[PDB]
Amino acid sequence: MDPETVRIALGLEERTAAWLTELDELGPPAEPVRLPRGEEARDLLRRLEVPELDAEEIVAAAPDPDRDPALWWLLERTHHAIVRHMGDHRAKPRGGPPLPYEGGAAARYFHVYVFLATVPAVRRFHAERGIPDEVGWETLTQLGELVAIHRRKYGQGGMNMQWWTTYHLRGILYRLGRLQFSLATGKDGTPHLGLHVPEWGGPLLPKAYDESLHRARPFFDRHFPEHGARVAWGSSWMLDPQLEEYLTEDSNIIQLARFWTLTDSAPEPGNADGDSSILEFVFRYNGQPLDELPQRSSLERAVIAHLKAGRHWHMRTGFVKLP
């Protein structure tokens, strides 16, 4: 097939042409793309903590090379475009565009199929790096979380966080207890670890946070000794000191943010760039009228109160030294 035919068949926008040309030049992977089917597929999806409802649907809608040629063309090359950067954190996180939902369940679940097809490759990388199996699997389970998030946010099955799963699939991100850590470099090339907080796994309890921090240096110095990070960096709505107006002393965020050293400037009060982030992570915001969002928790009430008052939330950036 040709990239223009794929683009038109799948209903992809004109801007995606450059990507599709790049995928055309890259070509199919050396190891043919294989999707698990049936109970094999159900076992893998369950291992990745995909909810039963979605997993059933994913298995049912799995595409076919003959009946879904445009989709298959893209699945092979997207897989290839990811595995070509296995272990490479300097490459940008390009998972490809979401597919228009007029293509049905196979289109909605496209990047789940990408993920499934790429599991063997990343698991081989984990093995080569000596990563324990439990850590490898624990890391890959965010697929289930992101699938669940799609359904909560939009109302039907899907997974549209494919840019983020390129981290898991390149073996450059590891879940080490409550927190995740990514191989990263600053603008000056200095190695660090990106610190991330997946939604699943309960509250950000101080003892769980501390355990994760203690795991970071030993893990990376053992399996990626060439990296040599000494510091973890975080960028998050969580680091916004404005939260102190609203959250009390029992807040995990408040207690733990106190250990962080913020490195960005106090943002302009009129800068609204951070509003969408906090709305995503607190409400999985999808354009609802604000006073029709839940108000059960102190943070839910905080986000809305602050915004109603004409004020703005900001992503802040900081670091903590690795123990």
Ligand X SMILES: CC(C)(COP(=O)(O)OP(=O)(O)OC[C@H]1O[C@@H](n2cnc3c(N)ncnc32)[C@H](O)[C@@H]1OP(=O)(O)O)[C@@H](O)C(=O)NCCC(=O)NCCS
Ligand Y SMILES: CCCCCCCCCC(=O)OC[C@H]1O[C@@H](O)[C@H](N)[C@@H](O)[C@@H]1O
Interacting residue ranges for ligand Y, rule: CB under 6 A: 161, 164, 195-197, 234, 236, 238-239, 253, 256-257
Q: Which does 21 bind (CB under 5 to 8 A by kind): ligand Y, ligand X, none?
A: none
Distance of CA 300 to the CA centre of its chain: 23
Determine if residue 52 is labeled as part of a ligand binding site: no
Residue closer to ligand Y (CB basis): 24 or 211: 211
Residue closer to ligand Y (CB basis): 78 or 236: 236
The CA distance from 216 to 182, in Å, is 10
Residues in the chain: 323
Both tokens assigned to 23: 């995928």
Check the CA dihedral 43-149-94-113 and report its sign.
positive
Residue closer to ligand X (CB basis): 158 or 194: 194
The CA distance from 211 to 317, in Å, is 22
Strands 191-196 and 231-236: parallel
Residue closer to ligand X (CB basis): 154 or 200: 200
Are 314 and 274 a contacting pair, CB within 8 Å? yes
Are 147 and 160 a contacting pair, CB within 8 Å? no
Minimum distance between the CB of residue 203 and ligand X, rounded to whole angstroms? 3
Distance of CA 80 to the CA centre of its chain: 19
Strands 173-176 and 191-196: unpaired
Q: Which does 297 bind (CB under 5 to 8 A by kind): ligand Y, ligand X, none?
A: ligand X
The CA distance from 139 to 202, in Å, is 16
Q: Which does 161 bind (CB under 5 to 8 A by kind): ligand Y, ligand X, none?
A: ligand Y
Should residue 319 be labelled a site residue for ligand X when binding is judged by CB under 6 A?
no
Tell me the DSSP string of 40-101: HHHHHHHHTT--HHHHHHHHHH---TTTSHHHHHHHHHHHHHHHTTTT-TTS-----PPPPG
Q: Of these, 197, 231, 262, 320, which contacts ligand X (CB under 6 A)?
A: 197
Residue closer to ligand Y (CB basis): 55 or 238: 238
Q: Of these, 300, 311, 317, 320, which contacts ligand X (CB under 6 A)?
A: 300
Residue number with the smallest Cβ distance to ligand Y? 234
Q: Which does 257 bind (CB under 5 to 8 A by kind): ligand Y, ligand X, none?
A: ligand Y
The CA distance from 88 to 166, in Å, is 10
Q: Which does 140 bind (CB under 5 to 8 A by kind): ligand Y, ligand X, none?
A: none
The CA distance from 148 to 55, in Å, is 11
Both tokens assigned to 29: 């992977």
Minimum distance between the CB of residue 296 and ligand X, rounded to whole angstroms? 7
Specify the stretch interacting with ligand X by CB under 6 A; choose among 94-102, 103-111, 125-133, 291-299: 291-299
Q: Of these, 137, 164, 246, 281, which contacts ligand X (CB under 6 A)?
A: 281
Should residue 182 be labelled a site residue for ligand X when binding is judged by CB under 6 A?
no
Q: Of these, 132, 203, 206, 228, which contacts ligand X (CB under 6 A)?
A: 203
Query: 116 phi and psi, to 5 degrees?
Result: -55, -45
Residue closer to ligand X (CB basis): 49 or 57: 49
Residue ranges for the known binding site for CoA are 197, 204, 237, 251-253, 281, 298, 300
Residues binding ligand X (CB under 6 A): 197, 199, 203-204, 236-238, 247, 251-253, 281-282, 297-300
Please give the annotated binding residues, written as ranges. 182, 192, 197, 204, 237, 251-253, 281, 298, 300
